[PDB]
Design a binder for these strands. Structure first.
Ligand SMILES: [Cl-]
Lengths: 194, 187
DNA sequence: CGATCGTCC
DNA sequence: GACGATCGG
């Protein structure tokens, strides 16, 4: 009955009231001395100078590659978003396998434990809302605060990669689909916000 | 890394696949069977079963997408079209509907009957979304939006406001893709 | 009761 | 592969 949609005409007319580069409603930077963590608007204090944050930041700066376990104390969220987004398009990178099960050193686990420790949350579990399904992907709030819809690819790809319901070949098809969808969006968004 | 920062790298990216062409290793299920599990696997059909007929006339009476879909209810292309359109309808609560849909006793009866005729791999993270193999066999990259959105909706790491931002992000990315692919594969 | 997901085989 | 902790319908 809905020939307007199956023919593509409906999607050809798509538009919204949101502007790229402007903050998503209710989103914004974390308070001073704190970093984004958990749900929308939630935050935890910073761990700059702690032994866990200092060890991980040095490994991150000495490698030039995206960190396996990322935290805002390691550097710019825009830099880790750019690295992961690029990794999703680089040939023979096996990015979906890296997002689900990255090679983790003991320093990455300590950084992850210290990040939840300072948060003051009661219980850590599979149900705890963290704002990122994969620890390598920065908190989604930084994309919401910056109005960077192209940074949603990293989260959408990581959600598919973390799911236990698709096999390797099925995940590869979804990465190809996501690649096609986001490539013109990323090109337009990066050109405008620079 | 100015090529990627300026966006020129992403404007140049091109794959080697063609919309409408079968994905490598993917195809229709064997005659008399329906796609199931991982890539290439399948299970026998239930087209004449009562549970499949009780949920078919329910899905055929209401022009809305089924809450628990199965190939015995109709063509996968129809359910994919309804879910994709629903993901773009303002105030549809599509992400919450994918995660926790209203389920009748007839839906779980059809659910149970599919496991009996047949690992954690199912080929669809949400039961309303048809098996991914149907999109891979049809070369429908636009049918990945339903799976990508459903994966986000099923995740426990984002709250509702965070999922809403990703829905708009997925909307803006897939809208030009869907307009081009739907027009090319339907005329 | 189902799910995700940390954590092993 | 699985087992379990742990939340929402
Ligand atoms: Cl194409």
């Amino acid at each position: 009955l809905d020939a307007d949609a199956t023919s593509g005409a409906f999607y050809a007319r798509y538009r919204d009231g949101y502007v790229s580069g402007e903050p998503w409603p209710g989103a914004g930077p974390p308070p001073p001395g704190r970093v984004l963590y958990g749900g929308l608007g939630d935050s935890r204090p910073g761990l700059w100078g702690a032994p866990e944050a200092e060890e991980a930041r040095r490994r991150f700066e000495a490698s030039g590659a995206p960190a396996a376990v990322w935290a805002p104390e390691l550097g710019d969220a825009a830099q880790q978003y750019a690295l992961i987004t690029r990794l999703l398009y680089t040939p023979d990178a096996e990015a979906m396998g890296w997002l689900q099960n990255p090679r983790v050193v003991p320093g990455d686990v300590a950084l992850d434990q210290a990040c939840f420790r300072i948060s003051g949350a009661a219980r850590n579990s599979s149900s705890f809302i963290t704002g990122s399904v994969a620890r390598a992907v920065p908190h989604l709030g930084y994309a919401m605060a910056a109005g960077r819809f192209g940074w949603g690819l990293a989260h959408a790809a990581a959600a598919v990669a973390m799911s236990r319901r698709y096999d390797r070949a099925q995940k590869g098809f979804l990465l190809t689909s996501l690649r096609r969808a986001y490539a013109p969006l990323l090109a337009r968004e990066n050109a405008a916000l620079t």
